[PDB]
Structure formats: structure tokens, C-alpha cells
Design a protein around this ligand. Sequence first.
Ligand SMILES: [Zn+2]
Ligand SMILES: [Zn+2]
Length: 96
Amino acid sequence: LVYPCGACRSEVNDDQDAILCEASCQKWFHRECTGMTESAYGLLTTEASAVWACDLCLKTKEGSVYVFTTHLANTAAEAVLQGRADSILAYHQQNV
Ligand SMILES: [Zn+2]
Ligand SMILES: [Zn+2]
């Protein structure tokens, strides 16, 4: 099969950091095509109860587990790294 990046349209390969808009548009995105940080990527992909939503799905409220936009994933991860949140789910819980 082939999996075109939802933003740049080239193939997303297994050796590339990538996230899936799995609860909506069903497209893979290269991490660097989304604005997501490395830390947000590492923490979100490790959390099986978390799903990510891409910017185009957010724009039309497509589809309307814990849901993170790129911005929420970034800020939750920064709080984790700073020792200000115990985990990205704990941050989501507190902040919505
Ligand atoms: Zn891409
Ligand atoms: Zn999407």
C-alpha cells in the first residue's frame, strides 16, 4: 500500500516520524509537516489512549480516548518536560 502525507502529499515511510489522523480523515502526516515538536511526538505516540486530529479536520470540525490538536500536544509535552504535569493525559484532564 501507499500512504501519502496529508500535508505535503509525498509518501510517508516507516523510517520517518509520522502521525495518523486516525479518528477522522485517515491520513498519515510527516511530523515536520505538522508543526509538532519531537517531545510531543514521542509522548503522544507512546500514549495508546490519546488520538491526534490534523488542522484540516479541526477547521471543519470533522467527526463531531483523549483528543489532541498539534497545539495541545505541544503545550502538554512542554509541561511534562518542565515537570509541571505528570503526563500528557494529566495535562489534558486539567486543561481540557
Ligand atoms: Zn509531509
Ligand atoms: Zn484529519
